[PDB]
A paper describes a structure:
Recently, several unassigned viruses isolated from mosquitoes, including the Omono River virus (OmRV), were identified as totivirus-like viruses, with features similar to those of the Totiviridae family. Here, we identified a new strain of OmRV and determined high-resolution structures for this virus using single-particle cryo-electron microscopy. Generally, members of Totiviridae and totivirus-like viruses have a non-segmented double-stranded RNA (dsRNA) genome containing two large overlapping open reading frames (ORFs), namely, ORF1 and ORF2, which encode the major capsid protein (MCP) and RNA-dependent RNA polymerase (RdRP), respectively. Similar to that of other members of Totiviridae, OmRV-LZ has a major capsid with icosahedral symmetry and a T = 1 lattice comprising 60 dimers composed of MCP-A and MCP-B. The central cross-sectional view of the map with the genome shows at least five visible layers of viral genome RNA packaged inside the capsid.
The final two three-dimensional (3-D) maps were resolved at 2.79 Å (full particles with genome) and 3.40 Å (empty particles without genome), respectively, based on the Fourier shell correlation (FSC) 0.143 criterion. The current resolution of the map for the full particle allows us to build ab initio atomic models of the MCPs. In each asymmetric unit, MCP-A and MCP-B share a similar tertiary structure, and the overall structures of these two subunits are well aligned with each other, showing a root mean square deviation (RMSD) of 0.66 Å for 728 Cα atom pairs. Each MCP-A is located close to the five-fold vertex, while MCP-B fills the vicinity of the three-fold axis. The ab initio models revealed that the first residue of the N-terminus of both MCP-A and MCP-B was clearly located at Pro789, which provides strong evidence for cleavage at CM-1 between residues Asn788 and Pro789 in OmRV. The C-terminal residues 1641–1685 of MCP-A are disordered. The MCP-B C-terminal residues 1618–1682 form a Ω-like arm structure composed of four loops and three α-helices. It extends along the interface between MCP A-B-A and interacts extensively with two neighbouring MCP-As. All these MCP A-B-A interactions strongly fasten the capsid decamer around the five-fold axis. However, in OmRV-LZ, the C-terminus of MCP-B, instead of N-terminus, play roles in stabilizing the capsid.
Numbering used by the authors:
A (entry chain B): 789 to 1610, 1618 to 1682
B (entry chain A): 789 to 1640
C (entry chain A): 1338 to 1436
D (entry chain A): 1487 to 1536
E (entry chain A): 1039 to 1137
């Protein structure tokens, strides 16, 4: 919140107060929290009616330090998911000179909620045991038309991990994020196309066209009409089956049953099959492309401009070949001939409306010839082309309906919301800041600096070094959970369940799915993530070069622990453990925004720990820096990516060191802190250098002692900002010597990105659009960093710390409002009771059927011999169930 | 755990504390949680790859004694089951010159858990008493499909013994592990293909192909199409029957009944049948071969390459011939013609898909001609060829079906986990270490030394001496229980039950079986087993020559009792009595890992006891040693296979003498122990010889008294490691004269095996991959062994024991261990604010782990 | 509504008029279908046939009103000369029949 | 708040009498189906009066 | 195919005067539908009555698709107390009524 008087900044909460862990439960951050402030919309409304094409800026009056008032000043939204692939130069569209951004994931099995066999599987085992008294081969009922021997094999040897569903739901949310772009322009912000290319102006008159494998440069059309994997460079295989017996022996252990709860629609069922095939294979299967009509700043030149979505570049390794087992239409003997097999399909697979070339060409609408016993030749298709043909037909409303049918088998609300959080964390991206004196700056068009970019975590994104397909693989950026086919098979049929797998009474998905407003919201959810990470890095004074080398440094020992505990590299009792200091950022988010991040569970010996997206990053990336006006790098600062008005205008509570400078009000303007706060001024041998009041330990260190670093003090950081915010500071040593790190040209600070204005807008003035809170303190070689003024330049600021004088600073002219976290149809009121009881019954539906053990017992030869009597089912202990105990 | 500081090694537990009995029940230590220690690992240069093909290795940053940092250095996983039969030399595959490894086993009988009669049997014998079974008709049969006269005559047997299922399930699991190699190349880590042949690179493009009797050299083919058993040669015999009346005399006592439950176990009843037959006959029947495409280290010379699985060579059982009684689907009198017998059966037995030659050739899919009461001739098939036919069709998913069916019929949980333990203990295998001053070393290509290998038990494995079929004098390794046919038949037909015969759900079958990761998990389970043995052979200083001769040729009484008590002995009935000191090794396992080994029932005279794989080895073996470069045998050391980092980084707790050195250049860097604790130095300055602070002598200063050996003292062993880790140690006696044992070339210590690097990886530096903990103290002659330095070389280390100096050694920068600056400008002790913010949430984890 | 519209209300609307599957694969009856049944019984004072159904071991009924599948196409009308017109809500029969 | 566009997540309410008045306007000879501004709707319409 | 066999009770066979007709009716009742396309032919004439002729219609019931059981086995009652047949003539004589 913005301070109105110095009394408000002086009474702001300390940083340690906000990093305490909190116990209360909290609602999710939906992004409407920002929408109420930066837009007209007050209640639910048609996105097309609202023209949210023009709702993409912070706006407001600004006050200058000289006493003039600027009206209709603006600041751009920092994030976007679009990477320009053609760029404007000299008012003419031209191709990109820079290689594309890429992301890599770590994917592994981990323990989840403990799992248990259902009543129905106890039924199946009873059927086998009662059969054993006979000469007859029919062991058990064949569930949902699948072969009874297959139910017999699926119902055996369960894993103790539990099941996750995370990678699946990620692939589905990445694709939803990509197709969301395809709606009309009135519902997408202009700013999203010009976060990187600030010289282009998108036209409102046509919707953007999403396509596949089209890019002009660097071999980014991964085969074109003859598709191959963007990373592997190969091609997959996909084969369909009625029974497991036809699956080749080399890969019968990898097969996946396709549940018939999906495919229940009158239409779009073959499409549902293609989509389910997409959610369990490797991603990306192709490079998607957004194409939008755009024009020059004058609106003269016009053309189709090419963009690559970030979601289409992030790699999630999975299976390349796969085998799906289609539901049977009626219980029957397995087919021995082709016609018997084709006639027997519930949904018969076919190619989508888009022809492909190469070996095994696919015609649009082409049907598959089912595999069967005694078949002369095994049949299969390349998978990259099968996913290619349907790729242009997927859209948001169908993914919503699919996901809604999926909802009725298993819980998918929280899991999807978590995978969506991960989507937003890996996809929204901002360009690096430029230093300046004034309010705006940008790098040269079609330059390496223009396109260099960063995560909400202040880490730079790696680039490709060669033409697609990529011969080699980048270090992983983040670790996600995998979904095992075996336990998937057990759960899809009702043989097993766990607390995270329970169907939910809503029978419905998160609000973000199926909306045309989704891109705007995802763009707005990245903001809090950066606010929390920047508070994390700016609470301490380490410079970007020192982070950049911290992991291996042996100059200091504390810097190493500091780097090492910010990432996830610990495990215990077979499962993943969250980064030890990511919990601090998680704590900060809750205390500052009064909301709760989405989390998954991990079981450690049976105890549940929560893991948010903050705790799962991996070491190896480079930290964000800022460039000079000429494009030279600047190392001296703490990492930064966004201007601090975003931090301080969208919080309920903020640490004291980061607050805004208060408005002029008659005599009183700005104020500092002195020896009455326990601070002290630093002087050296040189009489023409002065540094502010600082912590008392600062007098007795020029190098930090090994095993120790700079402390949290909010007031000293405050005076550090007051010194920097004068236009003439020196970033120096205890003795007044130059530090090893590169420093900006004098008096400059990093500032936010420039975008073209609308009529009536003004550019931001002075330091009203700049990071300020990045006060350096820890040099790479272990020296302290000081901010010096000359004596004459020193007098007014020191008296201002003494509160005898006043400093003059610019501010936004804005008030504080932070909203509370917060529909029945007539038909819903008509049916509310029946919905209330049926929803309650579905929660226990599990593998349940009305028949009890007491009925089935009457049908048995011997009740005592039944495995259900001698082994009643229990939840599995972790990591392993007891085996061969000492009697 | 590795040590970040010397306070961590002062506070480590004593060996005696860890050898102490613990009473609580503990969980099994599966490879599914051992897996995560290799993945999820500190280090920033690491490209954290997902494929299990690449998660094959121990990666990490390292720190030199000179203060330099090394990124992403590598240590290989020591074990494998594959044995190369083609060897690359000169960048090309070349036929191997070395003979195949072999394993052998002895049977025992199982009096534990004697059976209890069902009500059914008791009423049948009751009817035999009140009648003469005269009520029954010629054609009466049960629903199962056997006639009543047979069940009645089987009922009449009285058995002392319980039922075991062990040898059965063991054969099933060995075959499982062989078939588990057939999955795609991404699913098996490549390090497994190059533990022996380290000049070879497996290709990720194609799956390994599993065949049989295709070996290049040494008669390995086993006669090809006509299959003869690899041990002893000759064919077996197999026959099928609807009644036991038709089985020939002198074989009637040995017949097995096949329950319909075996036949309905899988979609193809013939496959389930052959699987049962293989399960209850002698193993191996043939030699399976794994073929994998490989390429040159430069990638220049690709080709197919042959490997022989270790499971394929273990020898178990002896039942060359058998008779199977099969259910009749109709209620009929016993057959008199051939066609009646054919029509009569529940499913007629058939040959498998792959045809074979011989005096009795079998066409593919050929149908057996059933036996009947008229006997123009008895009819029969060769058994090795009958199994050669079905050998290709066995598959891990179907085995998962089969195990589920067995679990329903009788509980398979406990028994299968124990059998799996024996499978790991017998098949997993590591090469003997070579000595070096530096980080990496290996023996010459296609050398005999390249192929010497050992168990997790640190016993060297036997090698074949002649071409197959073998006619060897047997050299067995361990005892196993056998499954008895009559006790089988009493249970298959409802005539008896036991306490361990409780039926189970199919869901409870252990998750390893039928899973494609299992091979990988196998290797992992070998690592903790060794650690335990390693801590047993190191706490005492006995050298490898002394272990080679204690049982066969040494006049010292103490070694004799020592080698004698480490192994098991027979009872008057012939039952096992478990190894006395083996109980110590079990204890170690449970204190270092907080996990338990499988337990198996045993009896002495009618007294319950248990047995683990730790207590069932046979006395009379040869021990692990190491090779100098150029391959000369050296045997001064106590036996060793694996590097210290493996022992140190997987344990929850280790004894004090085995802790890792702290990083160089810190306050509280490596140190030693002195008089105040209780030690005393030996000096010999008249000859330039100084030795560390050691244990006070007890009339055993130069020769040990007959009937006594060196005492357990953790701190002297530690000081001996300090003297050793210095560059030029010298192993001499009390006078400073040469010991009888062969010694390493000066300065050398045994070190881990070399493997080819991935790009971006580094070879380990210094003694970071060395084994250090094996310090000699007791020689074959009975004299003490001393580690000496010269009077000048010995001056700093004495000051470090005396704690007035620090020493410098290399380390791994893992798991909370950080680098030390050369200055050390200490400040006031200061808890960091982030550590106080996160203290509780951190302790919660430890508590959750403590629960488990 | 079921295949291509970004309005949430039509989506829930077309969704609730039809039946959905249970984890076992059993029918869960259409939620708004119960309204249509009610209409039938108030306009005619006669009942449609009822059939037993279960959710987890809980009794329920089903009529032909609640067992249609989502994803269909609807009734429209033709101009003379046969051009499609679709401004109206769907219709087949004249008011006198309803009345 | 649904005078020209319905809010996302809401639709027209059940009101019998307005539907009645709409039938009255329709049963007159030349009804015209347009929007709030009096502009053409996207749906195809009957030839006038039909 | 042993797992899928249906037993035909004698009650189906004594259902009608011709047991084969009742048998075929049971078989049609438990196999896949339709097996064939029935056709209704009716004489018709012109609106002036000028042009009479036969005219073909296809019933809507004939085109609905239900079931999937292409193949089946029927177990039939034995009218005599006998052991299972070994020859053809024994099996023919044995049955309650031969199909």
């Amino acid at each position: 919140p913005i301070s109105a008087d110095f009394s408000e900044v002086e009474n702001a909460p300390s940083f340690l107060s906000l990093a305490e862990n909190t116990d209360e439960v909290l609602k999710p951050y939906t992004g409407l929290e920002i929408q109420t402030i930066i837009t007209n919309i007050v209640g639910d409304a048609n996105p097309n009616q609202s023209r949210i094409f023009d709702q993409d800026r912070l706006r407001g009056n600004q006050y200058s330090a000289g006493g003039l008032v600027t009206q209709n000043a603006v600041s751009a939204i920092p994030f976007t998911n679009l990477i320009p692939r053609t760029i404007r130069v000299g008012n003419i569209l031209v191709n990109s000179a820079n290689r594309l951004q890429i992301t890599e994931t770590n994917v592994s099995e981990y323990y989840s909620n403990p799992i248990i066999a259902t009543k129905l599987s106890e039924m199946i085992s009873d059927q086998v045991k009662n059969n054993q008294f006979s000469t007859w081969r029919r062991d058990n009922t064949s569930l949902q038309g699948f072969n009874a021997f297959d139910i017999a094999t699926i119902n055996t040897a369960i894993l103790p991990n539990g099941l996750s569903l995370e990678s699946m739901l990620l692939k589905l949310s990445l694709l939803h994020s990509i197709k969301a772009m395809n709606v009309d322009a009135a519902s997408i912000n202009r700013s999203q196309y010009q976060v990187i290319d600030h010289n282009t102006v998108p036209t409102i008159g046509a919707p953007a066209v999403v396509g596949v494998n089209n890019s002009p440069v660097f071999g980014e059309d991964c085969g074109g009409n003859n598709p191959v994997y963007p990373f592997g460079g190969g091609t997959g295989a996909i084969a369909f089956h009625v029974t497991l017996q036809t699956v080749p022996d080399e890969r019968k252990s990898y097969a996946i049953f396709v549940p018939p709860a999906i495919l229940q629609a009158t239409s779009d069922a073959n499409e549902a099959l293609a989509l389910f095939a997409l959610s369990m294979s490797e991603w990306p299967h192709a490079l998607y492309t957004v194409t939008k009509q755009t024009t020059d700043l004058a609106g003269a030149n016009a053309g189709q401009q090419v963009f690559i979505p970030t979601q289409s570049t992030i790699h999630i390794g999975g299976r390349r070949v796969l085998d799906l087992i289609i539901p049977r239409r009626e219980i029957a003997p397995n087919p021995t001939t082709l016609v018997a097999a084709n006639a027997m399909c519930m949904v018969r697979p076919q190619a989508g409306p888009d022809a492909t070339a190469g070996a095994i060409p696919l015609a649009a609408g082409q049907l598959f010839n089912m595999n069967f016993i005694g078949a002369p030749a095994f049949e299969e298709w390349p998978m990259t082309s099968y996913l290619y043909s349907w790729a242009g037909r997927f859209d948001i409303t169908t993914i919503r309906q699919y996901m809604g049918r999926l909802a009725t088998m298993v819980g998918v609300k929280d899991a999807y919301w978590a995978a969506h959080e991960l989507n937003v964390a890996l996809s929204q991206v901002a360009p690096k800041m430029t230093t300046a004196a004034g309010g705006w700056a940008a790098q040269a068009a079609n330059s390496a600096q223009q396109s260099d970019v960063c995560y909400s975590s202040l880490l730079t994104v790696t680039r490709s070094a060669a033409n697609f397909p990529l011969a080699n693989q980048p270090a992983a950026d983040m670790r996600v959970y995998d979904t095992d086919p075996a336990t998937w098979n057990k759960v899809a049929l009702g043989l097993a369940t766990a607390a995270n797998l329970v169907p939910e009474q809503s029978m419905d998905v998160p609000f973000v799915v199926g909306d045309a407003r989704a891109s705007f919201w995802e763009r707005l959810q990245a903001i809090p993530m950066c606010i929390a990470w920047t508070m994390y890095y700016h609470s301490r004074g380490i410079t970007t070069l020192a982070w950049d080398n911290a992991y291996t440094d042996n100059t200091n020992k504390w810097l190493q622990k500091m780097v090492r505990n910010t990432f996830s590299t610990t495990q215990s009792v077979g499962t993943i453990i969250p980064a030890r200091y990511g919990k601090i950022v998680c704590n900060l988010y809750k205390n500052m925004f009064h909301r709760a991040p989405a989390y998954v569970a991990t079981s450690v010996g049976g105890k549940e720990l929560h893991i948010t997206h903050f705790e799962r990053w991996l070491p190896g990336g480079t930290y964000a820096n800022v460039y000079s006006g000429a494009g030279a790098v600047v190392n001296c600062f703490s990492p930064v990516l966004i201007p601090d008005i975003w931090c301080q205008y969208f919080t309920a509570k903020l640490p004291l060191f980061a607050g805004a400078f208060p408005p002029a009000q008659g005599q009183n303007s700005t104020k500092g802190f002195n020896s009455k706060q326990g601070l002290m001024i630093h002087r050296n041998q040189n009489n023409n250098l002065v540094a502010p009041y600082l912590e008392k330990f600062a007098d007795n260190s020029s190098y930090f002692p090994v095993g120790q670093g700079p402390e949290i003090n909010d007031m000293a950081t405050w005076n550090g900002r007051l010194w920097m915010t004068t236009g003439n500071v020196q970033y120096l040593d205890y003795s007044g010597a130059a530090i090893v790190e590169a420093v900006p040209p004098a008096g400059e600070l990093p500032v936010g990105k420039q975008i073209p204005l609308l009529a009536g807008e003004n550019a931001p003035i002075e330091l009203t659009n700049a990071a300020t809170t990045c006060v350096p303190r820890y040099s790479n070689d272990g020296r302290r960093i000081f901010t010096y003024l000359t004596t004459a330049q020193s007098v007014i600021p020191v008296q201002a710390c003494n509160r005898a004088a006043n400093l003059a600073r610019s501010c936004w002219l804005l008030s504080n409002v932070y909203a509370e976290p917060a529909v029945e149809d007539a038909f819903d009121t008509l049916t509310n009771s029946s919905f209330l009881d049926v929803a309650k019954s579905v929660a226990e539906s599990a593998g349940e059927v009305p028949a009890t053990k007491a009925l089935t017992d009457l049908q048995a030869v011997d009740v005592s011999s039944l495995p259900s009597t001698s082994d009643p089912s229990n939840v599995l202990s972790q990591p392993a169930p007891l085996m061969s105990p000492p009697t």
